[PDB]
């Protein structure tokens, strides 16, 4: 039941771009649109064009006058001096509504000829031909040209689509709406050596008569949204997957070995998606493109994908292979559902995004184990609860903007902040997991299969928005499909979390009555905060008992503040016996610390996390230690580790040490136990007569028994040793003293580990571990206190700091002689240099970071250097450094880097709105307002970063310091 918002329906669109010039960075092309009027007197036709100039527009080969106005280019009038962000946001929302593809109004309007009115009333095929030339298109695509002068194919210059969501309109005029569905025919005249990459399979290739160029014709069988379509032109090497003939791999020249390792696990991800969903992959062929300076590290398109060159990794390289593997899986999941099924309306994105995230999560659970998936879900839950407390609430399915607490409007994805948009997608994936907890997974997979089946039938037909309506999915349709499959609607769950836009925080205090042998639980909710919401739903609590593990569910009714559950017999304490754990295996547990009066070993609230929740339950120290030692659930172990953070008992420190010593324990839980051990040691300083915490552990596992200083050669074959090895000296540096200074002996031990570090035994790379060692050296250094404001000098430089400075200086020089694969050592050296400059040992230099931030240096080096400049500008309150960051955003070759600078500036503002700093000049406020008004519109993500920076600096209310 879908009716097109546009009166015209686009049956098919032809995309042709010819004679693209890398030197001029100019794209010239002619596009033909085939539309069928669904109403008489269609008259004026509106299409979405941004920064597009047409030589002429012909409808049915008849010239038609066209008028183009772009509100987004000038959201705020030059005469208007309003400096309140709320006024700018309201104007931006109105401008976005005018350019919205879903909205009937369009930025470009074409007046149908007087003689074409007679043809427009009868419903007949209508063809529009537009020829367009863009001298420098902004946000349509990104052109990368190397400094060396050579043939563009020979020098490896590459072109790829850039921007997010509806960025398709900038490169070529089109109906950029998810609701609109049409078959796609793509023809591109590119160089012979270069291979064009386009959505859909390539039907045919014809050589040009000159033969220095050729013509790549692309046809997509499945109708898709305009946003999905993308074009990349480069001399990409062509690789065909051995496992699957359809899958094709494209990489920059000489990066083929990295590409082979990156796409080695791609077939396994495809098999997992095929196993979970009966329907086979819809697209005839799948193409992967890896390009330098990518706008997004992971991008999803219909039958096509875009990834950063940084993702490509060699077999020896480690710690980047999982990140590349997960990025491929999430993009493939989006291709399976989000690309295959277009959104019926704007308010519908969450369901498609959530399904893609949920299926990717199922793949992660099988590939990395259930424990990794549970830890990942806990991380997702933590991000949402913190973000809602920080600002407003994460509202999905925006039915209007409704939730006004967020300054950005929810009307458009471009209006929404990039961080908020990511949080909204994460919440949708967690909501799908909540449905999986409520209803069996097999039923959930069956509902997904039905949606895929509707899309397949739409693809088979050409029914204009009739069978194509079936492909488009709605939230109502999703609820109905779940209700049919299980007999239970998910609408109450959707109303409780998605509609409310609230998070739940529970504080628990437990009182035990020995005479009645029952446990009484008191739950109080901080729903007073606007982001937080009241929960009347039941909460499941698991209480461990001597008899065994038992699950109790008590509804959190407002009327009843106390919930009472019976306690099992304590006979197991009286006579020693095995105690069954939640997992099938059971182990004997010491009961001396546990009180004789209370049988329960420990209490866990919502360990399953069936419903999203935040838990703040008070429990005795010894019970937390018992929970960490015997817990079979990683999330419960993580909460116990954080509860021991607020418990400086030597038995709590012992529990963390026992977990590290224990084999068959999650490596991430052990890494958290390492950090917590350091924190506890720093709280009970002067109560420890033993050797520094974790120094003995490092000697026991990573060092020879005969010699403590000597370190056994690193071996990364296990893949858990590297994580455990890297976290130990970091937490040893965090371990301080009674004077809160990292011990010289600990620093000397870390220096010895670097000196004896070997590389002729590790079959994998040690550069990732060596970067961690540089970070540990920076953490160990403690700032000197200047006397009479003494200037930092080489003579006054601390000798212990000088050894750290010597190591980082040698590492940076070695990095210049031999570069790291991701320049991890250089990024660590820049972070260490910033710490030394911030400390009273080395005078701070802004220029050293600024030179690293330049385009010529590697992108990873640039982002780290820019972050150091952002820290410097905040610390010194330097107006010129802030202006330099703003200037770089105004003129940055890579769009991704410019957005990152704005995001980092928001993360570390030079001045908060409440504070009154010398950087309160009206001209600075005007410059930020001008940046939001123009020069950020094309990216569609730059404006979101600028708006969030304006908020942290001044806010909704007009700047307190506005002359």
């Amino acid at each position: 039941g879908f009716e097109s918002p546009r009166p015209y329906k686009l049956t098919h669109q032809v995309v042709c771009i010819n004679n693209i010039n890398f030197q001029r960075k100019s794209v010239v092309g002619f596009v033909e649109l085939t539309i069928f009027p669904t109403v008489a007197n269609l008259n004026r036709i509106k299409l979405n064009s941004k920064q597009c100039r047409i030589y002429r527009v012909r409808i049915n080969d008849l010239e038609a006058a066209f008028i183009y106005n772009d509100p987004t280019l000038e959201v705020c009038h030059s005469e208007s001096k309003q400096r309140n962000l709320n006024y700018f946001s309201n104007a931006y929302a109105a401008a976005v509504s005018a350019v919205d593809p879903d909205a009937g109004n369009g930025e470009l309007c074409i007046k149908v000829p007087s003689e074409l009115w007679k043809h427009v009333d009868e419903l007949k095929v209508l063809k529009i031909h537009i020829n367009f030339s863009l001298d420098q298109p902004k946000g349509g695509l990104h052109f990368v040209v190397p400094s060396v002068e050579g043939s563009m194919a020979e020098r490896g210059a590459h072109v790829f689509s850039c921007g997010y969501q509806n960025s398709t309109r900038f490169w070529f005029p089109c109906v950029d709406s998810y609701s609109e569905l049409c078959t796609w025919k793509l023809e591109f005249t590119v160089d012979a050596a270069m291979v064009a990459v386009s959505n859909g399979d390539l039907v045919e290739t014809v050589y040009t008569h000159d033969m220095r160029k050729k013509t790549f014709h692309y046809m997509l069988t499945i109708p898709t949204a305009a946003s999905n379509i993308s074009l990349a032109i480069g001399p990409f090497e062509i690789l065909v997957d051995p496992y699957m003939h359809e899958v094709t791999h494209f990489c920059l020249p000489q990066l083929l070995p990295l590409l082979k390792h990156t796409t080695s696990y791609l077939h396994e991800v495809f098999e997992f998606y095929e196993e979970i969903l009966t329907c086979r992959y819809p697209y005839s062929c799948f193409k992967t493109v890896f390009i330098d300076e990518a706008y997004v590290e992971v991008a999803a398109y219909a039958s096509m994908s875009i990834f950063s060159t940084n993702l490509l990794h060699s077999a020896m390289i480690i710690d980047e292979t999982p990140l590349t593997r997960r990025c491929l899986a999430q993009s493939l999941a989006q291709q399976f559902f989000g690309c295959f099924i277009s959104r019926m309306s704007w308010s519908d994105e969450w369901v498609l995004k959530g399904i893609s995230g949920y299926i990717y999560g199922l793949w992660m659970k099988k590939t990395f184990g259930v424990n990794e998936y549970r830890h990942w879900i806990k991380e997702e839950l933590d991000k949402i609860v913190a973000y809602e407390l920080k600002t407003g609430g994460v509202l999905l399915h925006p039915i209007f903007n409704p939730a006004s607490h967020l300054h950005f409007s929810i009307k458009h994805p471009h209006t929404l902040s990039w961080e908020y948009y990511s949080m909204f997608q994460c919440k949708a994936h967690l909501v799908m997991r909540l449905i999986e907890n409520r209803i069996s997974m097999e039923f959930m997979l069956q509902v997904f299969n039905k949606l895929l089946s509707l899309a397949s039938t739409a693809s088979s037909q050409k029914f204009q928005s009739h069978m194509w309506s079936q492909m488009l999915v709605s939230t109502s349709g999703f609820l109905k499909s779940i209700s049919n499959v299980s007999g239970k609607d998910i609408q109450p769950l959707i109303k409780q979390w998605v509609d409310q836009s609230g998070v739940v925080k529970f504080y628990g205090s437990f009182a035990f009555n020995r005479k009645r042998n029952v446990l009484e639980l008191e739950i109080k909710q901080d729903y007073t905060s606007p982001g937080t919401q009241k929960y009347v739903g039941p909460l499941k609590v698991t209480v461990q008992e001597l008899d065994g593990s038992f699950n109790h569910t008590l509804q959190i009714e407002e009327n009843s503040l106390k919930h009472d559950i019976p306690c099992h017999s304590k006979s197991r304490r009286n006579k020693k016996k095995k105690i069954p754990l939640m997992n099938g295996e059971e182990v004997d547990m010491d009961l001396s610390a546990m009180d004789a009066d209370s049988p329960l070993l420990w209490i866990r609230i919502d360990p399953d996390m069936s419903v999203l929740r935040k838990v703040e339950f008070e429990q005795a120290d010894f019970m937390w230690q018992y929970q960490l030692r015997y817990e079979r659930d990683v999330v419960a172990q993580q909460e116990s580790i954080l509860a021991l953070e607020k418990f400086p008992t030597p038995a709590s420190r012992l529990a963390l040490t026992d977990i590290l010593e224990q084999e068959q324990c999650f490596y991430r839980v052990r890494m958290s136990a390492c950090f917590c051990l350091a924190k506890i040691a720093n709280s009970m300083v002067s109560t420890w007569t033993g050797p520094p915490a974790m120094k003995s552990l490092f000697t026991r596992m990573f060092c020879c028994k005969s010699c403590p200083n000597i370190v056994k050669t690193n071996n990364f074959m296990s893949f858990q040793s590297y994580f455990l090895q890297k976290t130990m000296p970091v937490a040893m540096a965090l371990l301080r003293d009674v004077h809160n200074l990292c011990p010289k002996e600990v620093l000397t031990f870390i220096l010895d580990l670097i000196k004896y570090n070997d590389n002729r035994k590790n079959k994998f790379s040690d550069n990732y571990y060596r970067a961690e060692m540089i970070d540990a050296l920076a953490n160990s250094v403690t700032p000197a206190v200047s006397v009479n404001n003494e200037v930092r000098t080489l003579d006054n430089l601390n000798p212990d700091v000088r050894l750290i400075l010597e190591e980082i200086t040698r590492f940076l020089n070695m990095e210049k002689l031999l570069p790291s694969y991701r320049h991890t050592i250089t990024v660590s050296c820049l972070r260490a240099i910033r710490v030394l400059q911030k400390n009273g040992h080395v005078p701070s230099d802004p220029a050293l970071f600024k030179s690293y931030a330049e385009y010529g240096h590697f992108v990873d080096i640039r982002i780290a250097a820019l972050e150091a400049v952002v820290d410097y500008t905040k610390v010194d309150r330097s107006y010129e450094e802030l202006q330099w960051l703003l200037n770089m955003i105004q003129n940055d070759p890579v769009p991704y880097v410019r957005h990152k600078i704005l995001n980092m500036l928001t993360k570390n503002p030079p001045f908060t709105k409440n504070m009154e700093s010398p950087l309160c000049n009206e001209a600075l406020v005007d410059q930020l307002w001008k940046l939001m008004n123009s020069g950020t519109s094309h990216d569609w993500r730059l404006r979101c970063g600028a708006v969030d920076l304006y908020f942290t600096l001044f806010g909704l209310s007009r700047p307190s310091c506005l002359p």
Partner: peptide
């Protein structure tokens, strides 16, 4: 780069 979980020790089946 691996599952890195002792599922067999945690659960017999």
């Amino acid at each position: 780069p691996w599952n890195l979980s002792n599922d067999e020790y945690y659960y017999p089946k």
